[PDB]
Design an enzyme around this catalytic site. Structure first.
Site, PDB file in Angstrom:
ATOM      1  N   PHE A 195       0.847  -1.223   0.000  1.00 47.34           N
ATOM      2  CA  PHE A 195       0.000   0.000   0.000  1.00 47.34           C
ATOM      3  C   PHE A 195       0.876   1.265   0.000  1.00 47.34           C
ATOM      4  O   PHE A 195       0.503   2.267  -0.649  1.00 47.34           O
ATOM      5  CB  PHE A 195      -0.944  -0.009   1.214  1.00 47.34           C
ATOM      6  CG  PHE A 195      -0.287  -0.244   2.560  1.00 47.34           C
ATOM      7  CD1 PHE A 195       0.437   0.764   3.191  1.00 47.34           C
ATOM      8  CD2 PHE A 195      -0.458  -1.449   3.234  1.00 47.34           C
ATOM      9  CE1 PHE A 195       1.013   0.555   4.440  1.00 47.34           C
ATOM     10  CE2 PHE A 195       0.118  -1.656   4.483  1.00 47.34           C
ATOM     11  CZ  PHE A 195       0.854  -0.658   5.084  1.00 47.34           C
ATOM     12  N   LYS A 199       3.761   8.488   7.140  1.00 50.87           N
ATOM     13  CA  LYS A 199       3.233   7.433   6.240  1.00 50.87           C
ATOM     14  C   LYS A 199       3.287   7.957   4.810  1.00 50.87           C
ATOM     15  O   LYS A 199       2.899   9.116   4.596  1.00 50.87           O
ATOM     16  CB  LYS A 199       1.811   7.024   6.630  1.00 50.87           C
ATOM     17  CG  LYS A 199       1.199   5.915   5.788  1.00 50.87           C
ATOM     18  CD  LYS A 199      -0.020   5.325   6.415  1.00 50.87           C
ATOM     19  CE  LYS A 199      -0.332   3.930   5.927  1.00 50.87           C
ATOM     20  NZ  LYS A 199      -1.069   3.974   4.653  1.00 50.87           N
ATOM     21  N   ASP A 222     -11.302  -2.978   8.491  1.00 50.07           N
ATOM     22  CA  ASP A 222     -10.205  -3.900   8.929  1.00 50.07           C
ATOM     23  C   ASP A 222      -9.916  -3.710  10.418  1.00 50.07           C
ATOM     24  O   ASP A 222      -8.770  -3.451  10.780  1.00 50.07           O
ATOM     25  CB  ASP A 222      -8.946  -3.746   8.067  1.00 50.07           C
ATOM     26  CG  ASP A 222      -8.091  -5.005   8.093  1.00 50.07           C
ATOM     27  OD1 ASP A 222      -8.584  -6.022   8.584  1.00 50.07           O
ATOM     28  OD2 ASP A 222      -6.931  -4.923   7.756  1.00 50.07           O
TER      29      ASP A 222
HETATM   30  C1  LIG Z   1      -4.718   7.031   9.953  1.00 52.28           C
HETATM   31  C2  LIG Z   1      -3.852   6.630   8.768  1.00 52.28           C
HETATM   32  C3  LIG Z   1      -3.181   7.837   8.129  1.00 52.28           C
HETATM   33  O1  LIG Z   1      -4.689   6.007   7.784  1.00 52.28           O
HETATM   34  C4  LIG Z   1      -2.830   5.654   9.201  1.00 52.28           C
HETATM   35  C5  LIG Z   1      -2.056   4.805   9.514  1.00 52.28           C
HETATM   36  C6  LIG Z   1      -1.103   3.822   9.939  1.00 52.28           C
HETATM   37  C7  LIG Z   1      -0.993   2.613   9.243  1.00 52.28           C
HETATM   38  C8  LIG Z   1      -0.080   1.651   9.638  1.00 52.28           C
HETATM   39  C9  LIG Z   1       0.716   1.904  10.744  1.00 52.28           C
HETATM   40  N1  LIG Z   1       1.601   1.087  11.405  1.00 52.28           N
HETATM   41  C10 LIG Z   1       2.068   1.732  12.514  1.00 52.28           C
HETATM   42  C11 LIG Z   1       1.536   2.986  12.598  1.00 52.28           C
HETATM   43  C12 LIG Z   1       1.832   4.000  13.609  1.00 52.28           C
HETATM   44  C13 LIG Z   1       2.712   3.743  14.655  1.00 52.28           C
HETATM   45  C14 LIG Z   1       2.823   4.718  15.619  1.00 52.28           C
HETATM   46  N2  LIG Z   1       2.147   5.877  15.579  1.00 52.28           N
HETATM   47  C15 LIG Z   1       1.341   6.053  14.500  1.00 52.28           C
HETATM   48  N3  LIG Z   1       0.681   7.211  14.410  1.00 52.28           N
HETATM   49  N4  LIG Z   1       1.154   5.155  13.503  1.00 52.28           N
HETATM   50  C16 LIG Z   1       0.633   3.113  11.457  1.00 52.28           C
HETATM   51  C17 LIG Z   1      -0.287   4.080  11.046  1.00 52.28           C
END
Ligand SMILES: CC(C)(O)C#Cc1ccc2[nH]cc(-c3ccnc(N)n3)c2c1
Length: 297
Positions: free
Chosen positions: A25, A43, A134
Protein backbone atom coordinates in the site's frame (compact mmCIF):
# COMPACT_ATOMS: atom_id res chain seq x y z
CA UNK A 1 13.74 -0.62 -1.95
CA UNK A 2 12.01 1.72 0.62
CA UNK A 3 10.42 4.95 -0.76
CA UNK A 4 12.42 7.23 1.69
CA UNK A 5 16.04 6.52 2.79
CA UNK A 6 17.33 6.67 6.41
CA UNK A 7 18.02 10.38 7.29
CA UNK A 8 15.79 11.62 4.40
CA UNK A 9 14.26 15.05 5.32
CA UNK A 10 10.65 15.61 4.09
CA UNK A 11 9.75 19.29 3.44
CA UNK A 12 12.90 20.50 5.32
CA UNK A 13 11.15 19.44 8.56
CA UNK A 14 10.62 15.64 9.14
CA UNK A 15 13.84 13.52 9.18
CA UNK A 16 13.44 9.70 8.82
CA UNK A 17 14.99 7.64 11.67
CA UNK A 18 13.65 4.15 10.64
CA UNK A 19 10.84 2.14 8.93
CA UNK A 20 8.30 0.81 11.53
CA UNK A 21 5.76 -0.70 9.01
CA UNK A 22 4.81 -1.18 5.32
CA UNK A 23 3.27 -3.45 2.62
CA UNK A 24 1.92 -3.18 -0.98
CA UNK A 25 0.00 0.00 0.00
CA UNK A 26 2.67 2.39 1.32
CA UNK A 27 5.23 2.57 4.19
CA UNK A 28 5.27 4.11 7.71
CA UNK A 29 8.42 5.70 9.25
CA UNK A 30 9.39 7.07 12.66
CA UNK A 31 10.73 10.65 12.02
CA UNK A 32 12.26 13.50 14.12
CA UNK A 33 10.19 16.72 13.78
CA UNK A 34 13.03 19.33 13.44
CA UNK A 35 10.56 22.17 14.33
CA UNK A 36 8.95 20.71 17.56
CA UNK A 37 11.83 18.30 18.56
CA UNK A 38 9.15 15.51 18.81
CA UNK A 39 9.21 12.03 17.17
CA UNK A 40 6.27 11.66 14.72
CA UNK A 41 4.75 8.97 12.43
CA UNK A 42 5.33 9.57 8.69
CA UNK A 43 3.23 7.43 6.24
CA UNK A 44 4.20 7.58 2.51
CA UNK A 45 2.65 6.26 -0.77
CA UNK A 46 4.42 6.15 -4.23
CA UNK A 47 3.11 8.97 -6.56
CA UNK A 48 2.92 6.40 -9.47
CA UNK A 49 1.24 3.60 -7.44
CA UNK A 50 -1.85 2.62 -9.48
CA UNK A 51 -4.19 2.98 -6.43
CA UNK A 52 -3.97 6.44 -4.71
CA UNK A 53 -5.41 5.67 -1.24
CA UNK A 54 -3.40 8.02 1.10
CA UNK A 55 -5.51 10.99 -0.19
CA UNK A 56 -8.68 9.26 1.25
CA UNK A 57 -6.83 8.24 4.53
CA UNK A 58 -5.84 11.89 5.20
CA UNK A 59 -9.45 13.10 4.38
CA UNK A 60 -10.84 10.64 7.05
CA UNK A 61 -8.10 11.56 9.63
CA UNK A 62 -8.88 15.28 9.06
CA UNK A 63 -12.69 14.79 9.51
CA UNK A 64 -11.99 13.01 12.85
CA UNK A 65 -9.67 15.73 14.33
CA UNK A 66 -11.02 16.71 17.78
CA UNK A 67 -12.54 13.25 18.50
CA UNK A 68 -10.83 11.21 21.30
CA UNK A 69 -8.88 8.03 20.15
CA UNK A 70 -7.65 9.64 16.89
CA UNK A 71 -4.02 10.49 15.99
CA UNK A 72 -3.40 14.25 15.88
CA UNK A 73 -2.82 15.27 12.25
CA UNK A 74 0.40 17.30 11.78
CA UNK A 75 0.80 17.73 7.97
CA UNK A 76 0.56 16.16 4.49
CA UNK A 77 1.89 16.73 0.99
CA UNK A 78 2.48 15.59 -2.56
CA UNK A 79 5.46 15.70 -4.99
CA UNK A 80 6.58 13.82 -8.14
CA UNK A 81 7.97 10.82 -6.07
CA UNK A 82 5.50 10.36 -3.13
CA UNK A 83 2.48 11.57 -1.17
CA UNK A 84 2.87 11.61 2.69
CA UNK A 85 1.00 12.31 5.99
CA UNK A 86 2.62 13.29 9.32
CA UNK A 87 0.75 12.29 12.51
CA UNK A 88 1.47 12.13 16.27
CA UNK A 89 3.57 9.00 17.14
CA UNK A 90 1.76 6.44 19.38
CA UNK A 91 3.21 3.50 21.35
CA UNK A 92 2.65 -0.28 21.05
CA UNK A 93 -0.31 -1.86 19.20
CA UNK A 94 -2.71 -4.31 21.02
CA UNK A 95 -1.48 -7.41 19.02
CA UNK A 96 2.09 -6.70 20.23
CA UNK A 97 0.77 -6.10 23.83
CA UNK A 98 -1.48 -9.28 23.77
CA UNK A 99 1.47 -11.50 22.60
CA UNK A 100 3.62 -10.03 25.43
CA UNK A 101 1.03 -11.33 28.00
CA UNK A 102 2.10 -14.64 29.61
CA UNK A 103 -0.78 -16.63 27.99
CA UNK A 104 -1.73 -14.23 25.16
CA UNK A 105 -4.76 -13.19 27.31
CA UNK A 106 -5.73 -9.83 28.88
CA UNK A 107 -7.69 -9.60 32.18
CA UNK A 108 -11.41 -8.81 31.92
CA UNK A 109 -10.43 -5.39 33.36
CA UNK A 110 -8.04 -4.63 30.38
CA UNK A 111 -10.40 -6.33 27.81
CA UNK A 112 -13.57 -4.39 28.83
CA UNK A 113 -11.78 -1.00 29.18
CA UNK A 114 -10.11 -1.36 25.70
CA UNK A 115 -13.58 -2.39 24.36
CA UNK A 116 -15.18 0.93 25.46
CA UNK A 117 -12.35 2.87 23.70
CA UNK A 118 -12.43 0.85 20.42
CA UNK A 119 -16.27 1.09 20.39
CA UNK A 120 -15.94 4.92 20.73
CA UNK A 121 -13.45 5.02 17.79
CA UNK A 122 -15.72 2.81 15.59
CA UNK A 123 -18.79 5.09 16.24
CA UNK A 124 -16.57 8.14 15.53
CA UNK A 125 -15.37 6.91 12.06
CA UNK A 126 -19.01 5.78 11.29
CA UNK A 127 -20.20 9.31 12.39
CA UNK A 128 -18.17 10.96 9.54
CA UNK A 129 -19.61 8.54 6.88
CA UNK A 130 -16.81 5.88 6.75
CA UNK A 131 -16.37 2.17 7.53
CA UNK A 132 -12.89 1.04 8.78
CA UNK A 133 -13.45 -2.48 7.31
CA UNK A 134 -10.21 -3.90 8.93
CA UNK A 135 -10.81 -3.65 12.70
CA UNK A 136 -8.13 -5.80 14.42
CA UNK A 137 -5.76 -5.45 17.41
CA UNK A 138 -2.67 -4.26 15.37
CA UNK A 139 -4.83 -1.25 14.16
CA UNK A 140 -5.08 0.12 17.77
CA UNK A 141 -2.05 1.67 19.58
CA UNK A 142 -1.71 2.95 23.18
CA UNK A 143 -0.40 6.55 23.54
CA UNK A 144 3.27 7.07 24.64
CA UNK A 145 2.90 10.31 26.76
CA UNK A 146 1.83 10.78 30.43
CA UNK A 147 -1.45 12.35 29.10
CA UNK A 148 -2.10 9.54 26.50
CA UNK A 149 -0.56 6.19 27.68
CA UNK A 150 -4.03 4.99 28.96
CA UNK A 151 -5.63 5.97 25.61
CA UNK A 152 -6.17 3.62 22.70
CA UNK A 153 -5.95 5.18 19.16
CA UNK A 154 -7.39 3.82 15.87
CA UNK A 155 -4.86 3.49 12.98
CA UNK A 156 -4.76 2.58 9.26
CA UNK A 157 -7.72 3.84 7.17
CA UNK A 158 -6.13 2.18 4.06
CA UNK A 159 -9.21 -0.15 3.61
CA UNK A 160 -11.89 2.41 4.68
CA UNK A 161 -14.91 3.18 2.41
CA UNK A 162 -17.47 6.02 2.50
CA UNK A 163 -20.88 4.29 3.03
CA UNK A 164 -22.85 7.60 2.44
CA UNK A 165 -23.31 9.75 -0.74
CA UNK A 166 -22.16 13.45 -0.84
CA UNK A 167 -25.52 14.52 0.83
CA UNK A 168 -25.55 12.10 3.86
CA UNK A 169 -27.78 9.24 2.54
CA UNK A 170 -26.74 5.53 2.82
CA UNK A 171 -25.36 4.54 -0.62
CA UNK A 172 -26.66 1.37 -2.32
CA UNK A 173 -24.64 -1.78 -1.52
CA UNK A 174 -22.89 -3.51 -4.45
CA UNK A 175 -24.51 -6.97 -5.05
CA UNK A 176 -20.95 -8.47 -4.77
CA UNK A 177 -18.06 -6.72 -2.90
CA UNK A 178 -14.74 -8.61 -2.74
CA UNK A 179 -13.63 -8.65 0.90
CA UNK A 180 -9.89 -7.77 1.21
CA UNK A 181 -9.53 -7.31 5.01
CA UNK A 182 -7.85 -9.62 7.60
CA UNK A 183 -9.38 -13.16 7.68
CA UNK A 184 -9.33 -13.80 11.45
CA UNK A 185 -11.73 -10.94 12.56
CA UNK A 186 -13.93 -10.71 9.36
CA UNK A 187 -17.75 -11.03 9.76
CA UNK A 188 -19.68 -13.90 8.03
CA UNK A 189 -21.08 -11.15 5.65
CA UNK A 190 -17.51 -10.12 4.60
CA UNK A 191 -16.71 -13.84 4.05
CA UNK A 192 -19.77 -14.06 1.66
CA UNK A 193 -18.39 -11.06 -0.35
CA UNK A 194 -21.35 -8.87 0.66
CA UNK A 195 -21.09 -5.09 0.93
CA UNK A 196 -19.78 -4.34 4.43
CA UNK A 197 -21.75 -2.19 6.84
CA UNK A 198 -21.21 -0.55 10.24
CA UNK A 199 -22.25 -3.93 11.79
CA UNK A 200 -19.25 -5.69 10.19
CA UNK A 201 -16.82 -3.31 12.07
CA UNK A 202 -18.72 -4.29 15.29
CA UNK A 203 -18.35 -8.06 14.46
CA UNK A 204 -14.56 -7.53 14.19
CA UNK A 205 -14.73 -5.82 17.65
CA UNK A 206 -16.80 -8.79 19.00
CA UNK A 207 -14.16 -11.34 17.82
CA UNK A 208 -11.21 -9.16 19.10
CA UNK A 209 -12.69 -8.93 22.64
CA UNK A 210 -13.33 -12.74 22.83
CA UNK A 211 -9.73 -13.33 21.61
CA UNK A 212 -8.39 -10.79 24.21
CA UNK A 213 -10.31 -12.42 27.13
CA UNK A 214 -9.90 -16.12 26.10
CA UNK A 215 -6.50 -16.01 24.29
CA UNK A 216 -7.74 -17.49 20.97
CA UNK A 217 -10.54 -17.89 18.38
CA UNK A 218 -11.51 -21.44 17.31
CA UNK A 219 -10.28 -20.82 13.68
CA UNK A 220 -6.92 -19.15 14.71
CA UNK A 221 -4.70 -21.86 12.98
CA UNK A 222 -6.61 -21.58 9.60
CA UNK A 223 -5.33 -18.91 7.14
CA UNK A 224 -7.57 -19.89 4.12
CA UNK A 225 -10.24 -17.18 3.67
CA UNK A 226 -12.91 -19.68 2.40
CA UNK A 227 -12.29 -22.38 5.13
CA UNK A 228 -12.51 -19.73 7.91
CA UNK A 229 -15.83 -18.32 6.49
CA UNK A 230 -17.26 -21.92 6.46
CA UNK A 231 -16.15 -22.44 10.12
CA UNK A 232 -17.66 -19.10 11.32
CA UNK A 233 -20.91 -19.72 9.33
CA UNK A 234 -21.57 -22.96 11.29
CA UNK A 235 -19.96 -21.95 14.65
CA UNK A 236 -22.48 -21.64 17.53
CA UNK A 237 -21.40 -18.10 18.62
CA UNK A 238 -23.08 -18.29 22.10
CA UNK A 239 -20.28 -20.83 22.78
CA UNK A 240 -17.63 -18.04 22.26
CA UNK A 241 -19.17 -16.44 25.44
CA UNK A 242 -18.90 -19.58 27.72
CA UNK A 243 -16.11 -17.82 29.73
CA UNK A 244 -17.21 -14.22 28.86
CA UNK A 245 -19.59 -11.98 30.89
CA UNK A 246 -23.30 -12.97 30.29
CA UNK A 247 -24.00 -9.36 29.08
CA UNK A 248 -22.01 -10.21 25.88
CA UNK A 249 -25.14 -12.18 24.71
CA UNK A 250 -26.85 -8.71 24.39
CA UNK A 251 -23.87 -7.64 22.12
CA UNK A 252 -24.01 -10.86 19.99
CA UNK A 253 -27.86 -10.83 19.60
CA UNK A 254 -27.75 -7.10 18.66
CA UNK A 255 -25.12 -7.26 15.90
CA UNK A 256 -26.71 -10.58 14.65
CA UNK A 257 -29.97 -8.58 14.15
CA UNK A 258 -28.28 -5.81 12.08
CA UNK A 259 -28.03 -5.56 8.26
CA UNK A 260 -26.12 -3.23 5.85
CA UNK A 261 -28.89 -0.54 6.08
CA UNK A 262 -29.43 -0.37 9.93
CA UNK A 263 -27.57 2.03 12.29
CA UNK A 264 -26.06 0.03 15.21
CA UNK A 265 -27.14 0.70 18.82
CA UNK A 266 -23.63 1.81 20.00
CA UNK A 267 -25.02 2.75 23.49
CA UNK A 268 -26.42 -0.84 23.89
CA UNK A 269 -22.89 -2.23 23.26
CA UNK A 270 -21.27 0.45 25.53
CA UNK A 271 -23.72 -0.50 28.38
CA UNK A 272 -22.65 -4.20 27.96
CA UNK A 273 -18.99 -3.23 28.70
CA UNK A 274 -20.11 -0.78 31.46
CA UNK A 275 -22.48 -3.34 33.17
CA UNK A 276 -19.77 -6.07 32.87
CA UNK A 277 -17.26 -3.74 34.67
CA UNK A 278 -19.81 -2.67 37.34
CA UNK A 279 -20.83 -6.36 38.06
CA UNK A 280 -17.17 -7.29 38.84
CA UNK A 281 -16.33 -3.97 40.66
CA UNK A 282 -13.96 -2.95 37.80
CA UNK A 283 -12.92 0.74 38.14
CA UNK A 284 -12.04 2.87 35.05
CA UNK A 285 -8.67 4.12 36.50
CA UNK A 286 -7.18 0.58 36.99
CA UNK A 287 -3.68 -0.19 35.56
CA UNK A 288 -3.67 -1.92 32.11
CA UNK A 289 -2.10 -5.45 32.33
CA UNK A 290 1.18 -4.27 30.62
CA UNK A 291 1.86 -1.38 33.14
CA UNK A 292 4.26 -1.86 36.14
CA UNK A 293 1.18 -2.03 38.52
CA UNK A 294 -0.54 -4.31 35.89
CA UNK A 295 2.54 -6.61 35.35
CA UNK A 296 3.03 -6.65 39.23
CA UNK A 297 0.45 -6.21 42.13
C1 LIG B 1 -4.72 7.03 9.95
C2 LIG B 1 -3.85 6.63 8.77
C3 LIG B 1 -3.18 7.84 8.13
O1 LIG B 1 -4.69 6.01 7.78
C4 LIG B 1 -2.83 5.65 9.20
C5 LIG B 1 -2.06 4.81 9.51
C6 LIG B 1 -1.10 3.82 9.94
C7 LIG B 1 -0.99 2.61 9.24
C8 LIG B 1 -0.08 1.65 9.64
C9 LIG B 1 0.72 1.90 10.74
N1 LIG B 1 1.60 1.09 11.40
C10 LIG B 1 2.07 1.73 12.51
C11 LIG B 1 1.54 2.99 12.60
C12 LIG B 1 1.83 4.00 13.61
C13 LIG B 1 2.71 3.74 14.65
C14 LIG B 1 2.82 4.72 15.62
N2 LIG B 1 2.15 5.88 15.58
C15 LIG B 1 1.34 6.05 14.50
N3 LIG B 1 0.68 7.21 14.41
N4 LIG B 1 1.15 5.16 13.50
C16 LIG B 1 0.63 3.11 11.46
C17 LIG B 1 -0.29 4.08 11.05
Amino acid sequence: ADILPANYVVKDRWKVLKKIGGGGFGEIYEAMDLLTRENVALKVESAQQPKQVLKMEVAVLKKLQGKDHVCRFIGCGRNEKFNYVVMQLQGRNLADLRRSQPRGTFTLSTTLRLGKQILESIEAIHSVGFLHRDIKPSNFAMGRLPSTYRKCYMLDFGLARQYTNTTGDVRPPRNVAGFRGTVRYASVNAHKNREMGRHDDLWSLFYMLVEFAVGQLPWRKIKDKEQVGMIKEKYEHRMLLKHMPSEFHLFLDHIASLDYFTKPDYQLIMSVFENSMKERGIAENEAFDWEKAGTDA
